[PDB]
C-alpha cells in the first residue's frame, strides 16, 4: 500500500466513503466550552494494554506510598489494603502480559481516582465531611513531613536543592516550563530595579547598565496569571498566587543564568516591593511565590493548554478530512496515540471540577480554565516554531547565555523533525499544484483556520505550500514529542515536592510571616500533589521515530517500502546521532535536562 | 475559667486544636449567593427545647 493525495487516488469513491464513515465515528462534544473537543472516546482509539500496563505498575506504586502515609498515620485493614494492591501488580506481570480484564476497569479507574483525587482511593473492587483523619492531613508539625510523605516513591533531588539560587535559576531554562524569559535591554516602568539589587547577586564588579547594553538582562513575567486567575479557598484556608515579576542575568562574557530581582505584583505599592538577592528570608519567599505561579502557569499554559489542547483540535480534524488512504494521515495519525483517550481524561476530571486542579492549585477551577483560554487564544500557530520563539525572546545566543538546555537540547530535535517531514512532505507533494489540489488538506486547513471562538486554532494557516506544509506538521509533531516531554515529565522529577513549587502558596506573601512550615499546602493535599504528578510524569509510552500501531500486534504502521526502507531509517538515524549529543552534554552538566534525549520521547501526548 | 487573647494562653496549642475541630463543625455553603451561609444547621445550634416549646404554643394557635 502506498498512500496517495486524493485528486490521485485510483479509487475516490471508495475513499471519500471512508471519511463519511470516519466522521461518524469522530464527532464533536463540548466537553471545554470555546474548544473543539471528541463526544467520549472512541472504540480504536481505546488505550492499547501495553499503555495500560504500563500506567497500571504507576498507579499502583502511588497507591501503595498511599497506604503506607496511611500506617504512619495511627502509629489489617490498611494491611489487607497493601497485599490487594500488590496482587494487582500481580495480575499486571502476568494476565494482560499473556496478550494472545484486569486491564479494562482497574487501571483506568485508578488514574480517575488520582487525577479525580477521590479519596476511598486505597483498593478498586473492595466496595464491602472532612477529610479521613487515618491519614495524612492538616497542618504539619514539621517541614518533615512532606518529605515523608514520598515512602514508597522516592524523593526526588530538587527537594534536597530547591532553596539555593543556582536551582532558582535551572526552574527558568532547565524546569518545567522552560520557555518564559525574554531578554531585554530597558526594565518595565512598573519594575526598576536597582543597581544594588544587581551588585548582590553580580558582584560589586558588574553593573545592571552593563548587562543591559551587552544583552545579558532576561526577564521572566507571569503578567497573565494576573489577568485571569481568582483566588479559591480550600475548607476555609486561603490559597493566592500573585503575578511576579522576576529579573536574571548571565556573567559578562557568558555563562549560566542566576536570579537579580523579584516583584511579587504586577504594580508597585507599599505592599509590593522588589525583593533582592540579600534580603534573606523575604527573599526564599519571594522566590517561592515565582513558583507557585509557575505552577499554575506551566501546568496550564505550558502543559495543558498548549500541548494537550491545542492537539485536541488537529487530532480532530485529521479523522474527518483526512482519508486513511492519505500520506498526510499516515505522517501525524500515529503521533496521535492516547491523545483522544487522555484529553478525556483531564476534561472529566484531572481539570474539571472537584479535581486534582482545582484542590492543590490556587484559583478557582474555573478562573484556571480561563487562564489556558487565554494563552490558546493569543498563540500564532504559524509563528511558534522553536526557533521562532527563540529570536522572539532573544535567548538566541549560545555564547551569552550559554546554559539553556532545552534550547539547544530542543533546537536539536526540531531539525530532525523537520527534515524528516521534509523529506516526507515533497515525496509525496511533488508539485506545488499537489498541495491546492488536494481537497483534504485545504478542507483540514479550513476547519482548522475556523476563528478561535469556532473550535479552531489560533493563527494556524492558511496551508497553501509545502513550505507551510512542512511547518504544519512540524509543529504538531514537536509538539506531540519533544515540546510535551519538556512540559510532562518534570512533573514527577521537579514538581512532586510541596515547598520545591505547588499550586498555592497557604500564606499570605514574600513578607515573611513565620516558620516556613505555614507557606505549604496541607497534608492531603501535598501527598496528592505528589501523588497525581508522579502518575503523569512516570509513564514512558511509544518512542519518537519509532511507528507502529495500538494494536497488540505492535506491528510496523508504515507500508510504504519508500519510507520505511529509507525514509524513516535516516530519521531514526539523525534521532540517534543528536541522541549522541545530547548525552554527551549532559554528563557535563549539574542539573540534568534528559527530556530532549530521543531514547526516551514519546510519539504522542498520552498521560 | 477565665477568658484569654490567645497571644497570652498558657496552653496555646490546645486552643489550635479546638478551633481546627471547630472549623469542621461550622463549614461553608453557599445557600444564598454572593453569601457565606453554614452547611445545614450544626448540631450545637440547633434549636434548644425552651425555643421548640415557645414556638410550638404559637404554631398551634396559627394551626
Given at each position: ?451 478561535f471562538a469556532e473550535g479552531g486554532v489560533s493563527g494556524f494557516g492558511p496551508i ?65 500533589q505528589a501523588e497525581f504528578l508522579y502518575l503523569l510524569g512516570g509513564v514512558h ?67
Open positions: 500500500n502506498i498512500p496517495t493525495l486524493p485528486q490521485n487516488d485510483p479509487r475516490p469513491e471508495q475513499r471519500a466513503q471512508q471519511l463519511d464513515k470516519a466522521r461518524e465515528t469522530y464527532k464533536y462534544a463540548d466537553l471545554l466550552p470555546p474548544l473543539a473537543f471528541c463526544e467520549g472516546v472512541p472504540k480504536p482509539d481505546t488505550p492499547s494494554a501495553a499503555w495500560l500496563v504500563t500506567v497500571g505498575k504507576v498507579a499502583a506504586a502511588v497507591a501503595l506510598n498511599a497506604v503506607a502515609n496511611r500506617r504512619a498515620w495511627k502509629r489489617f485493614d490498611v494491611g489487607g489494603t497493601s497485599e490487594e494492591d500488590q496482587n494487582e501488580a500481580g495480575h499486571n506481570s502476568f494476565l494482560a502480559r499473556l496478550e494472545n480484564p484486569s486491564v479494562l476497569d482497574e487501571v483506568n479507574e485508578r488514574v480517575a481516582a488520582i487525577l479525580g483525587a477521590k479519596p476511598n482511593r486505597h483498593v478498586p473492587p473492595a466496595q464491602a465531611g472532612n477529610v479521613s483523619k487515618d491519614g495524612p492531613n492538616g497542618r504539619p508539625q514539621s517541614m518533615d513531613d512532606y518529605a515523608n510523605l514520598f515512602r514508597r516513591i522516592t524523593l526526588p533531588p530538587i527537594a534536597s536543592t530547591w532553596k539555593n539560587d543556582s536551582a532558582f535559576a535551572a526552574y527558568r531554562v532547565a524546569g518545567p516550563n522552560a520557555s518564559m524569559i525574554q531578554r531585554i535591554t530597558e526594565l518595565p516602568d512598573n519594575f526598576a530595579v536597582t543597581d544594588a539589587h544587581y551588585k548582590q547577586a553580580m558582584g560589586e564588579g558588574d553593573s545592571l547598565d552593563a548587562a543591559k547594553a551587552e544583552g545579558r538582562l532576561f526577564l521572566a513575567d507571569w503578567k497573565l496569571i494576573g489577568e485571569t486567575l481568582v483566588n479559591n479557598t480550600y475548607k476555609g484556608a486561603q490559597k493566592t498566587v500573585y503575578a511576579p515579576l522576576a529579573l536574571f542575568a548571565v556573567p559578562p562574557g557568558g555563562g549560566s543564568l542566576a536570579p537579580v530581582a523579584i516583584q511579587p505584583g504586577q504594580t508597585p505599592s507599599p505592599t509590593n516591593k522588589i525583593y533582592a538577592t540579600q534580603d534573606g528570608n523575604d527573599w526564599l519567599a519571594a522566590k517561592s511565590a515565582v513558583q507557585v505561579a509557575e505552577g499554575n502557569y506551566h501546568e496550564l499554559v505550558s502543559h495543558l493548554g498548549l500541548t494537550h489542547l491545542l492537539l485536541e483540535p488537529i487530532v480532530m480534524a485529521t479523522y474527518r478530512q483526512l482519508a486513511q488512504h492519505h500520506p498526510i494521515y499516515m505522517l501525524l495519525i500515529p503521533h496521535f496515540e492516547g491523545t483522544l483517550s487522555i484529553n478525556n481524561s483531564a476534561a472529566t476530571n484531572l481539570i474539571a471540577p472537584g479535581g486534582a486542579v482545582d484542590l492543590i492549585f490556587a484559583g478557582t477551577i474555573e478562573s484556571e480554565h480561563q487562564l489556558a483560554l487565554a494563552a490558546l487564544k493569543r498563540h500564532d500557530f504559524m509563528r511558534s516554531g522553536l526557533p521562532d520563539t527563540i529570536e522572539q525572546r532573544g535567548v538566541g545566543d549560545t555564547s551569552v547565555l550559554t546554559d539553556y538546555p532545552y534550547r539547544d537540547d530542543g533546537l536539536k530535535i526540531w531539525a530532525n523533525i523537520e527534515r524528516w517531514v521534509t523529506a516526507y512532505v515533497n515525496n509525496y507533494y511533488i508539485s506545488e499544484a499537489n498541495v491546492t489540489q488536494d481537497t483534504e488538506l485545504q478542507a483540514w486547513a479550513a476547519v482548522l483556520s475556523k476563528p497553501d505550500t509545502r513550505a507551510a506544509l512542512i511547518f504544519a506538521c512540524t509543529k504538531v509533531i514537536f509538539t506531540a514529542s519533544a515540546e510535551h516531554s519538556a512540559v510532562n515529565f518534570p512533573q514527577k522529577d521537579l514538581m512532586s515536592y510541596a515547598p520545591a513549587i505547588t499550586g498555592a502558596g497557604w500564606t499570605a506573601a514574600p513578607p515573611s510571616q513565620g516558620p516556613l512550615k505555614d507557606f505549604q499546602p496541607p497534608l492531603e493535599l501535598a501527598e496528592l509510552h511509544t518512542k519518537l521515530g519509532f511507528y507502529n500501531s495500538n494494536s497488540f500486534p505492535y506491528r510496523a504502521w508504515f507500508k510504504d517500502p519508500k519510507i520505511t526502507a529509507e525514509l524513516l531509517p535516516a530519521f531514526q538515524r539523525d534521532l540517534a546521532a543528536s541522541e549522541e549529543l545530547i548525552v554527551a552534554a549532559n554528563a557535563t552538566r549539574t542539573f540534568k535536562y534528559t527530556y530532549m534525549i530521543p531514547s526516551t520521547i514519546p510519539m504522542s501526548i498520552n498521560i
